[PDB]
Amino acid sequence: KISLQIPIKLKSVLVDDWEYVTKDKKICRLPADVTVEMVLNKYEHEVSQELESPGSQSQLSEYCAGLKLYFDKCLGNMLLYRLERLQYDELLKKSSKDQKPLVPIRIYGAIHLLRLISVLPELISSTTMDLQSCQLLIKQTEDFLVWLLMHVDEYFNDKDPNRSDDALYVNTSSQYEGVALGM
């Protein structure tokens, strides 16, 4: 049984979100400023600048692309709370009306990536993967967590949407509430 030991501050950030999309009824403002792709490209670029071994950087880029594609394919299935699903559907409608097939990675913020990571242990232990492969995955995502916690106040700052602007979250109207929750 594998275990992933997230730093405490990111657990607090996750619980803070878990309240925000629950009984305060806010949602994630989209398209956010720092999507998933910018995060991971910055991570990989910064880590390849210091790493000298070839296989290290090969496994680095493999991890990057793999996390990317799996987020891309799983976001719709199991990363969204109940209240958000309506915004998701509306985004699909807009994309299909504009004839651009939807990519989750170029709209959604990093908080969903933290949601993914927080899930990841169950995702892996529900499978038949190799012990060494799952172990290297845990070590890898752990290094990603470390690099993320070094910059935690660049993405996850608080701004109180009800007063100034451009906070990471926004409020919903009563019609959006009614449709999304009480369809």
């Binding site: 405490i8 607090s12 619980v15 700052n157 608080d158 701004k159 109180d160």
Partner: protein
């Protein structure tokens, strides 16, 4: 700016830390009072609030001083 309080990082995992210096250590607003959460004593905060008060009165006096001295400079220029 924003919050000054952590969540309840309850259980065994939390680490309480006693300072070695008790007069100008600032560190947070998550203090815990005793006879990373940084413990402190009543007399310490007494001293720190006196520090705030007296530095504030000093800087207020200095602001009035620079105000009056600019006033006197612009008067003597006239």
């Amino acid at each position: 700016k924003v919050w000054k309080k952590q969540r309840l990082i309850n259980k065994k995992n939390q680490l309480y830390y006693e300072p070695l210096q008790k007069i100008g250590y600032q560190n947070n607003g998550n203090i815990q009072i005793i006879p990373k959460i940084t413990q402190i004593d009543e007399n310490s905060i007494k001293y720190d609030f006196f520090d705030k008060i007296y530095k504030s009165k000093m800087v207020q006096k200095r602001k009035l001083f620079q105000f009056q001295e600019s006033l006197i400079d612009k008067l003597v220029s006239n």
